[PDB]
Design a binder for these strands. Structure first.
Ligand SMILES: [Mg+2]
Ligand SMILES: [Mg+2]
Ligand SMILES: [Mg+2]
Ligand SMILES: [Mg+2]
Lengths: 159, 159
DNA sequence: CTGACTCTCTTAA
DNA sequence: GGTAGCCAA
DNA sequence: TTGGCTACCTTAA
DNA sequence: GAGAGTCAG
């Protein structure tokens, strides 16, 4: 049964999967702030990343910078992100370890997938949701605090 | 599906599961050397460990020494170890990341279960298989090298 | 504006 | 993610 | 001899 | 496990 196989992935994602939304300051972007969603799984054994990549028909594999002979399975473009999300909604309910992260991650991805960040308030909202997301993880951090980012969005608006 | 749930576990085990066989020098044991098999999964989210434990009907949960507020799901007694192994043999075929570790782990666990370590040569073989196991691991280590352990067994045999 | 490659930072395995 | 010490059972 | 709680060591997430 | 820079597209 491949249901078992899909249980393998979801189980694998709960253990070593990663839902992240970076904030990149780009002057030519609306609001002067960009949100960049990135789902990924790191692994020494390139093999498993290959299966998953093949069973989901999305994402790419690479060498993890700074850690030679280690690989990262990544899926970040909007199109593949939707498929990824489509996939997880199916079992989201049994998601134990990372249910919240995903839910918050989906909310942001979809939000961008619906151009919510195309207006000031919309952008501020997603940015806030990104910081909430960080609060959910142990290994995450932020270069600048929320108010700082928000004050940059306001500066841009005055333009 | 209970099958999907079984895939969640196997996937979880491949990512963050642990198959270990410690060597402990105990002067009153046969060969002066003991091999101690331990399967375990560490996790901050105690919840997920509770499920797995409740689903495998075996193992225990504890806080992880040195890492307050982090938990470890451990299954090490011979009885539970067999059930654990019985479980994994089922899907052992699809195991990608840790297939070898398990196979080598099982060989040792079983070997002790059948008292193979009760005769010198038998004990020596399992000890060797343990070092092979460490070779398969990235985060493992040995306090003493193999020849040293083997020379302790020989010393004890003279007595 | 988004894609994606390069690089950086943290700790739970 | 993996080892090893100890002492009771 | 094995159980299992305590303490220690490493890096792949 | 997770965040940010840069520049081509
Ligand atoms: Mg991007
Ligand atoms: Mg792993
Ligand atoms: Mg034991
Ligand atoms: Mg891990």
């Amino acid at each position: 049964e491949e249901d078992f196989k899909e249980g393998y992935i979801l189980g694998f994602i709960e253990a070593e999967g990663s839902f992240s939304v970076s904030i990149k300051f780009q002057r030519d972007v609306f609001g002067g702030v960009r949100l960049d969603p990135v789902f990924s799984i790191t692994q020494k054994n390139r093999e498993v990343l290959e299966a998953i990549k093949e069973h989901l028909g999305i994402g790419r594999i690479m060498e993890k910078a700074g850690q030679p002979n280690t690989y990262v399975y990544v899926v970040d473009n909007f199109n593949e992100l939707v498929k990824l999300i489509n996939f997880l909604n199916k079992y989201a309910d049994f998601m134990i370890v990372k249910k919240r992260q995903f839910l918050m991650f989906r909310e942001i991805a979809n939000g961008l997938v619906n151009g919510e960040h195309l207006h000031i308030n919309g952008l501020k909202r997603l940015v806030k949701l990104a910081y909430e997301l960080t609060k959910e993880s142990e290994k995450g951090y932020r270069k600048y605090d929320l108010n700082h980012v928000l004050s940059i969005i306001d500066k841009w608006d005055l333009g």
